[PDB]
Every structure is written in structure tokens, then in C-alpha cells.
Amino acid sequence: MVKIRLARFGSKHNPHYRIVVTDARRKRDGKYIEKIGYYDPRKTTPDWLKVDVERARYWLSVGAQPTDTARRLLRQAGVFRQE
Amino acid sequence: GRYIGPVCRLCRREGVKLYLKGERCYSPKCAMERRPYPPGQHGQKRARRPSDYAVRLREKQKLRRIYGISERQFRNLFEEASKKKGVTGSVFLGLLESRLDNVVYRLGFAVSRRQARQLVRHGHITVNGRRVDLPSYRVRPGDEIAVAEKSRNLELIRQNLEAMKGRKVGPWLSLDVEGMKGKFLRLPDREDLALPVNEQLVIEFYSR
Amino acid sequence: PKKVLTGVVVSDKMQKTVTVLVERQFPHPLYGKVIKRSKKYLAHDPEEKYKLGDVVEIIESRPISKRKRFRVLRLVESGRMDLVEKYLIRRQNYESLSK
Amino acid sequence: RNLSALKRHRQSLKRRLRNKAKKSAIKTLSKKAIQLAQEGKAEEALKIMRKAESLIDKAAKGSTLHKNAAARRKSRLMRKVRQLLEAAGAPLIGGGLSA
RNA sequence: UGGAGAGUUUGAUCCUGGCUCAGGGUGAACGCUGGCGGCGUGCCUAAGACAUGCAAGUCGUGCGGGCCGCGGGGUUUUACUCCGUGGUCAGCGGCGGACGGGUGAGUAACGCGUGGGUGACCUACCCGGAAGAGGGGGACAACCCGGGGAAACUCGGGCUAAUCCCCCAUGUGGACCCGCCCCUUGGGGUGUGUCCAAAGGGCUUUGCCCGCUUCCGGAUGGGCCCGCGUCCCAUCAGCUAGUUGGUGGGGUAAUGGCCCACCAAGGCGACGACGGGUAGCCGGUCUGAGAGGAUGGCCGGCCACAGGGGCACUGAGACACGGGCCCCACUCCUACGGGAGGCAGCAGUUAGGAAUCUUCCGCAAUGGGCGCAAGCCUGACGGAGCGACGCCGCUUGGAGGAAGAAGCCCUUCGGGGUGUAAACUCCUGAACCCGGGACGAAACCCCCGACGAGGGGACUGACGGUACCGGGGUAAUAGCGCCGGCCAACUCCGUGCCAGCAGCCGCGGUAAUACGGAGGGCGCGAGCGUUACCCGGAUUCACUGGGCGUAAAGGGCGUGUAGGCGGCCUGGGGCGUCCCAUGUGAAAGACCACGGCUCAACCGUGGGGGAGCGUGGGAUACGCUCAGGCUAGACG
Ligand SMILES: [K+]
Ligand SMILES: [K+]
Ligand SMILES: [K+]
Ligand SMILES: [K+]
Ligand SMILES: [K+]
Ligand SMILES: [K+]
Ligand SMILES: [K+]
Ligand SMILES: [K+]
Ligand SMILES: [K+]
Ligand SMILES: [K+]
Ligand SMILES: [K+]
Ligand SMILES: [K+]
Ligand SMILES: [Mg+2]
Ligand SMILES: [Mg+2]
Ligand SMILES: [Mg+2]
Ligand SMILES: [Mg+2]
Ligand SMILES: [Mg+2]
Ligand SMILES: [Mg+2]
Ligand SMILES: [Mg+2]
Ligand SMILES: [Mg+2]
Ligand SMILES: [Mg+2]
Ligand SMILES: [Mg+2]
Ligand SMILES: [Mg+2]
Ligand SMILES: [Mg+2]
Ligand SMILES: [Mg+2]
Ligand SMILES: [Mg+2]
Ligand SMILES: [Mg+2]
Ligand SMILES: [Mg+2]
Ligand SMILES: [Mg+2]
Ligand SMILES: [Mg+2]
Ligand SMILES: [Mg+2]
Ligand SMILES: [Mg+2]
Ligand SMILES: [Mg+2]
Ligand SMILES: [Mg+2]
Ligand SMILES: [Mg+2]
Ligand SMILES: [Mg+2]
Ligand SMILES: [Mg+2]
Ligand SMILES: [Mg+2]
Ligand SMILES: [Mg+2]
Ligand SMILES: [Mg+2]
Ligand SMILES: [Mg+2]
Ligand SMILES: [Mg+2]
Ligand SMILES: [Mg+2]
Ligand SMILES: [Mg+2]
Ligand SMILES: [Mg+2]
Ligand SMILES: [Mg+2]
Ligand SMILES: [Mg+2]
Ligand SMILES: [Mg+2]
Ligand SMILES: [Mg+2]
Ligand SMILES: [Mg+2]
Ligand SMILES: [Mg+2]
Ligand SMILES: [Mg+2]
Ligand SMILES: [Mg+2]
Ligand SMILES: [Mg+2]
Ligand SMILES: [Mg+2]
Ligand SMILES: [Mg+2]
Ligand SMILES: [Mg+2]
Ligand SMILES: [Mg+2]
Ligand SMILES: [Mg+2]
Ligand SMILES: [Mg+2]
Ligand SMILES: [Mg+2]
Ligand SMILES: [Mg+2]
Ligand SMILES: [Mg+2]
Ligand SMILES: [Mg+2]
Ligand SMILES: [Mg+2]
Ligand SMILES: [Mg+2]
Ligand SMILES: [Mg+2]
Ligand SMILES: [Mg+2]
Ligand SMILES: [Mg+2]
Ligand SMILES: [Mg+2]
Ligand SMILES: [Mg+2]
Ligand SMILES: [Mg+2]
Ligand SMILES: [Mg+2]
Ligand SMILES: [Mg+2]
Ligand SMILES: [Mg+2]
Ligand SMILES: [Mg+2]
Ligand SMILES: [Mg+2]
Ligand SMILES: [Mg+2]
Ligand SMILES: [Mg+2]
Ligand SMILES: [Mg+2]
Ligand SMILES: [Mg+2]
Ligand SMILES: [Mg+2]
Ligand SMILES: [Mg+2]
Ligand SMILES: [Mg+2]
Ligand SMILES: [Mg+2]
Ligand SMILES: [Mg+2]
Ligand SMILES: [Mg+2]
Ligand SMILES: [Mg+2]
Ligand SMILES: [Mg+2]
Ligand SMILES: [Mg+2]
Ligand SMILES: [Mg+2]
Ligand SMILES: [Mg+2]
Ligand SMILES: [Mg+2]
Ligand SMILES: [Mg+2]
Ligand SMILES: [Mg+2]
Ligand SMILES: [Mg+2]
Ligand SMILES: [Mg+2]
Ligand SMILES: [Mg+2]
Ligand SMILES: [Mg+2]
Ligand SMILES: [Mg+2]
Ligand SMILES: [Mg+2]
Ligand SMILES: [Mg+2]
Ligand SMILES: [Mg+2]
Ligand SMILES: [Mg+2]
Ligand SMILES: [Mg+2]
Ligand SMILES: [Mg+2]
Ligand SMILES: [Mg+2]
Ligand SMILES: [Mg+2]
Ligand SMILES: [Mg+2]
Ligand SMILES: [Mg+2]
Ligand SMILES: [Mg+2]
Ligand SMILES: [Mg+2]
Ligand SMILES: [Mg+2]
Ligand SMILES: [Mg+2]
Ligand SMILES: [Mg+2]
Ligand SMILES: [Mg+2]
Ligand SMILES: [Mg+2]
Ligand SMILES: [Mg+2]
Ligand SMILES: [Mg+2]
Ligand SMILES: [Mg+2]
Ligand SMILES: [Mg+2]
Ligand SMILES: [Mg+2]
Ligand SMILES: [Mg+2]
Ligand SMILES: [Mg+2]
Ligand SMILES: [Mg+2]
Ligand SMILES: [Mg+2]
Ligand SMILES: [Mg+2]
Ligand SMILES: [Zn+2]
């Protein structure tokens, strides 16, 4: 299936993830379908987590499955907020 | 490496009085005041008409040995300037003058650039509050270069900033003597520098 | 869109098949001269409608057989045997250089 | 000294004997039906073609004779039967073939 | 925002012309030397051969058991047996093993790049929508019994469960033949006839959860087809028998000569077929003013391969690296009958080679498989280790210090040089010694809410007592090449065409700035040189950008085929050409801006780009084409 997960792009001891939509079969740093956000786990900058909300809603509507970490990051970005 | 060794021998070889010891290049003991000829057994002999490559190489070596920067960082800074937009020479000089050790020397915290290098390397210098121990650090316009509060009681800093009373600083620099700090106002213009170096000769030297 | 070419029928000797020669001009990649290349395509004529010399349009099609991947869209203009004669002369010249 | 995924191998063998069986039936029945269509016996031919189609679809239920290859077999069978009966006529039983 | 030349044919000159050097680059190696850290990187040769460990499994919420153990029952005891439970072992069953990881062999090809087609197709798991799950029946393992074999393992008989297989029914629907309609290749709709569905389990138990079946669609992934592009050799010129096409079949998810029967004689080629050679291709990378040349290592995309060759099975998907069968070579076991194996997975061994690493730590992070979940697996990965292999940062001190110690080298014997260099004076405090001590990690889970949104709680760190912060604190590695010209740096002695140096010109045969040593100097510096290779200079294969009277170079001459090229005027078309809009041009890299590790290397974010190709529209000067006209070319 198509999944929403994190890809590692930073250097050694400097992790930087791209929140990304890709087929689960391809490698985690391989050709992804679309970059829907980025995440910095060490909080180096005031903007360490950005997510495109409408695109995430689309890819969830068509049937993508986020990882538990990806789902956590999306929930922190109010992707599931229906208030 | 930083070439470490005799310095006023460069005052002699370069043919122009350099200031590598800070003082004693102003006193009648520089050995350039009393021995203006180049070093070596063949220093007093009649010099032959140098080639163009000789002129450009000696000019570039003068400009490099003034700051005490290795050939690696020097060539890297030159290529970096040539990549940028604007006059290569003036931008190169503004880059060299932006080095933290050179800024420490210009602000009168150290009498020589090598003493400034030792002051920076030993963490006696702060930038915007945070301690920095890298002579190759690039100072940006607006940064406050200060003296470490734990080092302001040392004898050398007391002497240097006690002699800086009444002295003037470069047009692109400000200095607070009581607080033992200063500010890097802007990048210096070519007119601001009194360097005895022709930058176009260095540009032509690296044009080869 | 399915590619559409335009060429000359130079061989009707097959059953339900024609040989459409298609030319093309393009500037040389390095020397800039407008050079003229050509290629023959085996086109499908299910009614034996087109004959020798007919200038026809050709459309990319679902494969009919090996080497046969095109159909004849329509007839641009009727038989002009000058181009067929040029092709036949260019072929016949090959018998002069053997050994 | 090897891993127990050999189990898979074993399973495949079973499935092999399961698939080869079904197909072996289908083909056979098909031939039979076609024979009865060539000889003119229409009621029997269609009565057997019904069972052949049933076996085809039931094999399509599983992984033996899955997607539209089964429709291909059914189409070819029904076409051949209707064509061979048209050489004789009288489609008596009125089974798989539409009116 | 971009372009340097020089040495060398001569007694001297100009030209042609080759050679060589200064530059940059490297998966490098070798010599001398060698202090620290960060980030990268590391079998280019034998796609040679491999000991050993690990690397692909997982579900008791699909099912029945074996072994060992415990508890409670039917009994007065025994025998026997029922239920619960723990551990363990496989088995049947489902999903995964087709991903991930490795390598460059083979391939000059729809392999790849690029732009399209599929009205000729498939897609397990996932998402949305509609509907449904009624009844019956059966077998094989595990297990029990017997046999064969040295072993691998194998054969026969018997019992049994299921989400295992089968039958009938229900027909939301779908499949097929035929007919009609719309559409136009096999797309969609409709009618009759025929055919086709299902499986249960778990609970917080009559209500939900994980599922199951049929169908439509989405999404993702892929199969096939086509235009254009992709090295050298013409001392390879003719190639082709399934060859080219047709009909009808078989085959596949699907077109096809893919395969097969019958029929027609075709198909390809100097616009380079066929053949030989070499070689994965690309994003990119190196270089370059650019055009271009070279290259395809790391990372990313596609391909192919898994000792060599061939083949099918299973499956949504394989012609399957750690699945199966056969042949061949090799190694091992062997009761000589017969078997076992396949590092181009991680590490490691050996061989080859100038040369390329640890038989390491970890499931914490990211990702992947199975599972409701807990959780299990993961040599993917995250880290550490080794190697100046590269890039970057840093240290071996800072300041004062004689008309100038000694030693050493020159010397006009007056002196000069090594040189403020040193010893010394004062100061800072690399190393180290202590103390604190991480970010990377908040989700899965549990609770409230409604297993939703939302809120709350809890666990979890390999790196690692590492980074970093504070205190204390010692002056504490420098080497390598060069010094005749190109090319920056000169003297002494030794040697005597000897010993030797040398990239090119060249130097040495008695007083060598060229050999060797010394003093001194120049260049770089934890590096410096050498060799190899690539681009550069090289306008020296000249598109930008060259030439052929005498320097290399006009064919011995003609006729003339293909091809290349085409006088003047008008018109049509719009193929070349040009313009606008749009799609494409993945990411990384490159460029610019800001930001994170104290800087930098490294990295993040954002921005900007861009040739080419597809589509729609437009322009018609020129090239093209068609039609007409003219006479200056040509011919008569
Ligand atoms: K011929
Ligand atoms: K000369
Ligand atoms: K048995
Ligand atoms: K019906
Ligand atoms: K699709
Ligand atoms: K496999
Ligand atoms: K201190
Ligand atoms: K929640
Ligand atoms: K300290
Ligand atoms: K000798
Ligand atoms: K010498
Ligand atoms: K060009
Ligand atoms: Mg994939
Ligand atoms: Mg935020
Ligand atoms: Mg939502
Ligand atoms: Mg510039
Ligand atoms: Mg520039
Ligand atoms: Mg044409
Ligand atoms: Mg014909
Ligand atoms: Mg055909
Ligand atoms: Mg298994
Ligand atoms: Mg299994
Ligand atoms: Mg039979
Ligand atoms: Mg199958
Ligand atoms: Mg020359
Ligand atoms: Mg001569
Ligand atoms: Mg001479
Ligand atoms: Mg002469
Ligand atoms: Mg070189
Ligand atoms: Mg070089
Ligand atoms: Mg050593
Ligand atoms: Mg390292
Ligand atoms: Mg490593
Ligand atoms: Mg290589
Ligand atoms: Mg290899
Ligand atoms: Mg008991
Ligand atoms: Mg009783
Ligand atoms: Mg008893
Ligand atoms: Mg048990
Ligand atoms: Mg089990
Ligand atoms: Mg068994
Ligand atoms: Mg792979
Ligand atoms: Mg070949
Ligand atoms: Mg060839
Ligand atoms: Mg293509
Ligand atoms: Mg091609
Ligand atoms: Mg394509
Ligand atoms: Mg299914
Ligand atoms: Mg299914
Ligand atoms: Mg569904
Ligand atoms: Mg039963
Ligand atoms: Mg039964
Ligand atoms: Mg039974
Ligand atoms: Mg039995
Ligand atoms: Mg029994
Ligand atoms: Mg079933
Ligand atoms: Mg119906
Ligand atoms: Mg039924
Ligand atoms: Mg049933
Ligand atoms: Mg109930
Ligand atoms: Mg289940
Ligand atoms: Mg597609
Ligand atoms: Mg063939
Ligand atoms: Mg056919
Ligand atoms: Mg298949
Ligand atoms: Mg051929
Ligand atoms: Mg051609
Ligand atoms: Mg090869
Ligand atoms: Mg460049
Ligand atoms: Mg470039
Ligand atoms: Mg280029
Ligand atoms: Mg290439
Ligand atoms: Mg590769
Ligand atoms: Mg690659
Ligand atoms: Mg091997
Ligand atoms: Mg093989
Ligand atoms: Mg084999
Ligand atoms: Mg499957
Ligand atoms: Mg394969
Ligand atoms: Mg295999
Ligand atoms: Mg293996
Ligand atoms: Mg075996
Ligand atoms: Mg060896
Ligand atoms: Mg390693
Ligand atoms: Mg471990
Ligand atoms: Mg893990
Ligand atoms: Mg995980
Ligand atoms: Mg790793
Ligand atoms: Mg360095
Ligand atoms: Mg000193
Ligand atoms: Mg002290
Ligand atoms: Mg935290
Ligand atoms: Mg609850
Ligand atoms: Mg929460
Ligand atoms: Mg966990
Ligand atoms: Mg710890
Ligand atoms: Mg400290
Ligand atoms: Mg010189
Ligand atoms: Mg020498
Ligand atoms: Mg050389
Ligand atoms: Mg002598
Ligand atoms: Mg001598
Ligand atoms: Mg000498
Ligand atoms: Mg020396
Ligand atoms: Mg080197
Ligand atoms: Mg060269
Ligand atoms: Mg060139
Ligand atoms: Mg040039
Ligand atoms: Mg040449
Ligand atoms: Mg030219
Ligand atoms: Mg020439
Ligand atoms: Mg000549
Ligand atoms: Mg002549
Ligand atoms: Mg012609
Ligand atoms: Mg002609
Ligand atoms: Mg004209
Ligand atoms: Mg013409
Ligand atoms: Mg016109
Ligand atoms: Mg046009
Ligand atoms: Mg890009
Ligand atoms: Mg970027
Ligand atoms: Mg910064
Ligand atoms: Mg553009
Ligand atoms: Mg257009
Ligand atoms: Mg017009
Ligand atoms: Mg005319
Ligand atoms: Mg005349
Ligand atoms: Zn001086």
C-alpha cells in the first residue's frame, strides 16, 4: 500500500526527516510520490515541523496509511482536528 | 601550521616593513630599520630584474603573510570572493578583515595578529555573548566582539586596553574600552585599509 | 496522442500491408545543417485500398504483428511515382558496390 | 541446516495437484462438447457445454483459472459450439447459448 | 561576471609542426614524514574459491494434537476418563519469503534517456460506495502402526480439526454466446438464455472488533507498444527460413510471427543492415570561457545477474540470491548403492594484486514483515572501530629580547650570514586530571471521551559518562620537495663524459649555481613529493575554431548515379524557422538567500531556475512544397 512516513535526509548525528508519501515497498530514502512536510527532531529552529494539511487530508482520503510516528506528527499539526 | 617561526625575516624579505610582532616593529629593533635587505648569505648582493611571476608571487605572499593565513584558507577565500558578485579585490579584503583574529587585532585587544590568534584560540574572546575560539570565524556587520568576563582580570588585557585609551579605531569599528568590547559596524572599503599591497597583482597571480 | 506521420507507399507486394517511407528534416546536433533522414514503416491496409505511389498518413496503432505497428489513417494525395522511382534507384544502386 | 520455508514448497506441490486436476477436467469436457457439436448432437453438446462453463467459473473462484483468462476460455468454447451447430442446426436444449 | 602562456629544429630569422611544462581532478597507490577532531569515504584485479556466526519470518484472536508438569471433577478404592492451566515441539492453515540487501558478469538492445499510446492490460495489502454470507458433505498432515536406507530421507496402512477442499441454494451484481443502441480497434449500455459467491474468530456477548464474498471506483505499483537520442571498426557489404505477410488457431492479465498449422514471397541494407570489438544506462561528476571532451565510484532512478546452462511449479506478483527440478565443473559425506552445498547479504579467510576495513555495539531512532494488541524478526538501518584516502577546523606558543652568544658556512681577513632566531624574562594554558552531564523520545500502549476529535498518564538511549559546561593545569610533534632555463630560490667543497642527474631543452672529460655533501635560500606544511589516469593549455580533428603552389595535404583525367546545393516575380499550404500559453523537466547535486552544529566541511528550509519533447493558438521574411509566369544561368 501507499504510506505516509519519514525519510532521513540529515547528516550523521544530525537527523532531518521529510514527511513523505511513498509506496511501502520502496526504500525509505528512495523515490517518493510527494513531500508533504518536514520534521526536525532536535528542535534546532523555531520551525522544526511543517506539514501541508490539505495534501495530507487528500492522501488520507485516497487511502494512504501513516506510520505511528508520522501519525503523531500529523496529529500535532492538526491534520485530524475536526473542532 | 601557521608558518610558526621567525617573523621579522619576512619584514626583510618582503622589502616592506611588516608588523608581525605588534610592537618592536615600531621600535628601532625591527631589524628592518637597520637591515632592509632580504635575508640569507645572498641578501646584500645586487638583485636581478625580477620576472612578472616573481612580482605577483611576492605581492601575494606579502598580502598573505600580513594576516598569517595558510595557503589553503587563503586560496579558498580568494575563490569564494571570485564566485561572489562585485570587485574581487575589495570583497577579498573585506573577507580577510572579517576574520575574528584580525578583528581582535584591529580593535586593539592584541598588539599583533598572532597574539590575537592565541587569545581567540584560548577562549578569551566572546562574540555576541557566546565564547568563540576560532580565528577563522567570520564576523558579520552588527556582531559585538567582547572580552571574556573571566579574562578581563588578566595582565595582558589590562595592558593592551590600558594603552588603547585615547587611540582611534577603524571607521568600520567601534570600541567600548571600559566594558572591554567593540562592534563590527560594516565591511571595510578599500580606502579604509592602508595595506601596502596591490590586490590586482594577486588577482593576476591567481589568474594563471 | 498517437503519433501521426506522412509518407509514400513503396511496396504493395504484401497481403494487407504497405511500406510507407516517411522523411523528416532536422538541424544537425553539432553542425546545424538541416539534414533529411528517412525511415520505412510497415502499415496495415486491411482492404488493399492503397497502392504504389500513394502519399498517405499513418497512425500509431495496437500492434498487428512483429514489425507492423501502424495503420493507414487516410490518403493525402494519389499516386506520384517520382518518389517511388527515387527510392527504387537508391535501392538499385546497392548492386553496383559489392566486389 | 536450512529454514522451514520448505513448508511453502510442500504447499505448492499440493496446490499443483489441485490446479492440474481442474484444468485437466475442463479441457477434456471442452473437447467432448466440441465433438458433439461437430457431429450435430445439439442437446447433448449444449448440456455438456453448460457443465464445462460451470467448471471454468468454479476454477476461476480460486487461484487455478483466475481472472479473465476464464472468460477467454468460455468465449472460445461458446463461439466454437455455436459455429459447429450452425453447420447442422437445431439448437435443441437451449442452454448456454442465447436465443 | 568569461578566455595568460612558456621551453625546444637555426650561426641568427620568420613559418609550419610535434614533444614537454606550469592548472584542476582521483574509489588512488608508493616513498619520506606523521599530533587532535568533525564529516565523508574505502576489492577499480579473480562475476576466483570460501571455514565460522548472524543475515526471513510471523500469527494460539484460523485448527487438531505430541511430550513434560500442575490443579479440579465422575468413583468408596482401583482401572478408566472429563475440564481448566503452564511450558515446549512441530504440523495443518493465512500473510510475508517477488520488498529490503549485493554485484557490473551479460547486454549496442525499446536496455536506458525522453515524450507519448494501451479502444490491448493486471495490481495482494489500503481507501470510498452497493449488496450478501442459507444448508450439507469430504480429504491430507500432526498422531498411531509396519517396512526400506549407512545417510539424505523414504514407502505403505489407519484416526481427525479448521478461515483446508467440495456440492446445492440465494443473483445486489458480474462473466459468456447472440441481437439492438450509443461510441469507435476489445469503450459504454440493454434484452433473453446460461454460468459464478462466501469463513469464521475474538470479546468489554446478543453489540461491537478482526475478518470473509460479489461488484464499481480511487490510489499505488507494473506489463506491453511507438517517435527521437545513445561508442569504435567498411582491413565486416550484402543479411534473412520463423525469415516478411496473411488466414485460422494455441498461449498470456493483454497486443504480437510469442508459438503452431496452411497460404502468399517477401523483409532489411552506404540514412551503414549483417559481422567483429568494446561497454550496464541515466540523474550527475571532472574539466572547460563556452561549445565540447572524459567519465557513470559514493547517493538516487531504471536494467540485468545470483557457480555455468536450461526449465517449470506455487502465487496478485517470480522463471524466485539465502524456493524446486535436470545437465556441467568444483568441494564435502559415503557402508561406493547414493547424498549434501552455492557470501556478486554482514563481518571474516584465502588467492590474485601496486592496493581497499571489524569474524564490533544496538532495536533506542527511521523504515520494513507478521499480529486486534502485547510483541516477535530485521548484518535494512542507526552507531562505534581501522586507514592522513578526501574535505574542513585546530595545535606544536604569545609578548619583551644584542650593532648581534656559541657552533656551523662564507670572506677582499676589515667583515658578512644563520637572526630576535636562541638561551633567557613575563604571560596564556594543547594535552591531561576531576565534577556535572545531554538533545536525539513521544508515539505505539493505558485512562477519560465514543477504541473518533481532543485531553491526560506511563515506559523506552546503541552511540555513551560520548558531546557539552565548570574548575585545575604542563611551552608542549615538523616535515617534504625544490634552488641552470621554462620557474620563486646561490655559495663552498668533493668528484673529473667517472660516480650520477633529467618533465622538455640539456649538465659532468679540473677550478659544475644542473652530479654528491654542506651552509643558506624558495615553496607548501600534517603533510610534501612520485607514478598512473582524465580534462586543460590543444585554435593539435578547428560547429564555435584549421588547412592543402614550395612546410603533412587536390584524386592522373573525364563521363556521370545517389546525395548536397538552387536565377527573377506572384499565389496557396505552414514541413523547416519563429512567437504566446500550457504540460513535462522526480529528489539529491549545481546557483542564490536565510538558518543549525562555537566556524567551516556537513546539513536544513525557502527561492530561482533550465535545453529538450507533448498539446492548443498564432506569424509567413527566409528555407521547403504545389500551381502559374519571366529570360539575365543553361541549351538549341
Ligand atoms: K540484392
Ligand atoms: K630562440
Ligand atoms: K504417511
Ligand atoms: K440475466
Ligand atoms: K489505475
Ligand atoms: K526467492
Ligand atoms: K584557568
Ligand atoms: K487519542
Ligand atoms: K578551562
Ligand atoms: K667515483
Ligand atoms: K647539487
Ligand atoms: K554549437
Ligand atoms: Mg517498488
Ligand atoms: Mg508548530
Ligand atoms: Mg481528518
Ligand atoms: Mg568577484
Ligand atoms: Mg565571478
Ligand atoms: Mg515524405
Ligand atoms: Mg498489398
Ligand atoms: Mg496478423
Ligand atoms: Mg516457512
Ligand atoms: Mg508459514
Ligand atoms: Mg484426457
Ligand atoms: Mg497462475
Ligand atoms: Mg610550440
Ligand atoms: Mg633544418
Ligand atoms: Mg644550436
Ligand atoms: Mg642557414
Ligand atoms: Mg597534472
Ligand atoms: Mg596535478
Ligand atoms: Mg611509519
Ligand atoms: Mg571517521
Ligand atoms: Mg565506514
Ligand atoms: Mg575505477
Ligand atoms: Mg568486482
Ligand atoms: Mg489429575
Ligand atoms: Mg454417588
Ligand atoms: Mg483397588
Ligand atoms: Mg500443547
Ligand atoms: Mg506453531
Ligand atoms: Mg512433515
Ligand atoms: Mg533490490
Ligand atoms: Mg556487437
Ligand atoms: Mg552492430
Ligand atoms: Mg522509449
Ligand atoms: Mg532504438
Ligand atoms: Mg517512458
Ligand atoms: Mg483478498
Ligand atoms: Mg481476493
Ligand atoms: Mg472495501
Ligand atoms: Mg465436517
Ligand atoms: Mg467429516
Ligand atoms: Mg470425516
Ligand atoms: Mg492414508
Ligand atoms: Mg489413532
Ligand atoms: Mg476459501
Ligand atoms: Mg442482473
Ligand atoms: Mg450456484
Ligand atoms: Mg460451508
Ligand atoms: Mg452472541
Ligand atoms: Mg485474525
Ligand atoms: Mg502507466
Ligand atoms: Mg520470430
Ligand atoms: Mg495470429
Ligand atoms: Mg502468469
Ligand atoms: Mg534482419
Ligand atoms: Mg535510416
Ligand atoms: Mg562488459
Ligand atoms: Mg565551471
Ligand atoms: Mg562547471
Ligand atoms: Mg558540460
Ligand atoms: Mg557515457
Ligand atoms: Mg551503481
Ligand atoms: Mg547507483
Ligand atoms: Mg563466486
Ligand atoms: Mg544459473
Ligand atoms: Mg544453477
Ligand atoms: Mg499471495
Ligand atoms: Mg530473475
Ligand atoms: Mg531459482
Ligand atoms: Mg547466500
Ligand atoms: Mg536439495
Ligand atoms: Mg599476495
Ligand atoms: Mg566499513
Ligand atoms: Mg548484537
Ligand atoms: Mg527497530
Ligand atoms: Mg518501528
Ligand atoms: Mg551503516
Ligand atoms: Mg588541514
Ligand atoms: Mg619569539
Ligand atoms: Mg600559569
Ligand atoms: Mg524530549
Ligand atoms: Mg474505553
Ligand atoms: Mg494523545
Ligand atoms: Mg517499542
Ligand atoms: Mg548510557
Ligand atoms: Mg576546560
Ligand atoms: Mg630564477
Ligand atoms: Mg635532483
Ligand atoms: Mg612526466
Ligand atoms: Mg678537485
Ligand atoms: Mg668545484
Ligand atoms: Mg649545486
Ligand atoms: Mg637546509
Ligand atoms: Mg598527494
Ligand atoms: Mg595532457
Ligand atoms: Mg579542442
Ligand atoms: Mg580553447
Ligand atoms: Mg595529436
Ligand atoms: Mg571549420
Ligand atoms: Mg593547420
Ligand atoms: Mg606538398
Ligand atoms: Mg591535377
Ligand atoms: Mg537528386
Ligand atoms: Mg542529381
Ligand atoms: Mg529561391
Ligand atoms: Mg531541392
Ligand atoms: Mg507565399
Ligand atoms: Mg509550422
Ligand atoms: Mg532539481
Ligand atoms: Mg535544495
Ligand atoms: Mg552559522
Ligand atoms: Mg521555463
Ligand atoms: Mg504548434
Ligand atoms: Mg498566411
Ligand atoms: Mg516553373
Ligand atoms: Mg548560343
Ligand atoms: Zn618587523
Side-chain angles (χ1 to χ4, degrees), chain B residues 2-150:
Chain B
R2 335 159 33 200
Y3 161 79
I4 287 296
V7 280
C8 276
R9 95 190 305 270
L10 307 183
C11 293
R12 293 207 293 163
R13 162 63 66 175
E14 248 54 41
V16 182
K17 165 179 289 299
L18 298 184
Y19 305 96
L20 310 181
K21 291 178 170 299
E23 206 222 334
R24 196 190 195 275
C25 283
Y26 300 102
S27 304
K29 298 177 183 179
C30 175
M32 188 60 180
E33 212 82 16
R34 53 225 302 177
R35 301 171 68 180
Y37 45 89
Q41 168 188 336
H42 320 274
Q44 303 186 30
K45 296 183 179 181
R46 192 73 174 187
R48 311 175 187 90
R49 200 271 294 179
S51 59
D52 309 2
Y53 177 80
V55 178
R56 303 187 197 91
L57 183 271
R58 291 261 57 89
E59 201 74 15
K60 160 256 184 178
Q61 282 293 79
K62 185 194 308 177
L63 197 271
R64 163 201 157 189
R65 292 169 173 176
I66 279 181
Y67 291 82
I69 265 62
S70 66
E71 187 58 37
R72 198 70 177 181
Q73 304 189 51
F74 195 86
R75 183 81 188 275
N76 289 20
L77 285 178
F78 178 87
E79 295 301 306
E80 174 174 42
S82 182
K83 292 178 179 299
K84 302 177 69 63
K85 294 184 178 181
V87 180
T88 317
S90 62
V91 170
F92 193 21
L93 286 180
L95 263 49
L96 288 169
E97 211 73 21
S98 302
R99 292 182 55 89
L100 184 57
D101 52 358
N102 179 87
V103 171
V104 169
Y105 164 75
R106 288 295 187 182
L107 282 182
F109 291 163
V111 67
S112 63
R113 286 185 174 90
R114 315 214 296 183
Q115 181 175 82
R117 192 177 189 96
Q118 187 181 250
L119 287 179
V120 175
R121 248 279 85 173
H122 286 163
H124 299 302
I125 301 302
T126 132
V127 172
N128 302 319
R130 244 64 63 186
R131 171 181 57 256
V132 181
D133 56 4
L134 299 149
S136 59
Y137 181 85
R138 172 165 304 171
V139 187
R140 307 177 181 181
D143 303 339
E144 172 173 313
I145 304 96
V147 178
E149 303 81 54
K150 302 88 187 176

Side-chain angles (χ1 to χ4, degrees), chain D residues 23-87:
Chain D
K23 292 202 186 73
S24 295
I26 298 172
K27 307 174 182 180
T28 298
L29 293 192
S30 307
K31 313 169 189 176
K32 195 174 184 184
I34 298 180
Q35 277 282 13
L36 315 178
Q38 179 228 355
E39 311 174 290
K41 285 83 82 69
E43 180 189 328
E44 201 73 289
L46 301 184
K47 211 277 301 298
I48 286 187
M49 186 236 285
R50 292 140 136 260
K51 304 179 179 181
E53 171 185 11
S54 177
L55 285 199
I56 291 176
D57 280 333
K58 287 174 172 179
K61 292 170 54 183
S63 58
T64 298
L65 223 262
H66 235 347
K67 80 287 243 62
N68 26 14
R72 171 181 73 250
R73 302 213 174 191
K74 290 167 57 181
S75 174
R76 287 172 173 171
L77 215 213
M78 299 185 69
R79 285 177 60 258
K80 272 182 280 293
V81 172
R82 182 186 280 261
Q83 288 169 353
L84 277 181
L85 289 188
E86 283 180 25

Side-chain angles (χ1 to χ4, degrees), chain B residues 177-194:
Chain B
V177 190
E178 293 190 7
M180 305 199 177
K181 60 179 182 177
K183 256 209 171 185
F184 187 91
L185 315 178
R186 71 173 190 276
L187 291 183
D189 292 325
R190 170 56 199 162
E191 273 53 48
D192 295 326
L193 282 320

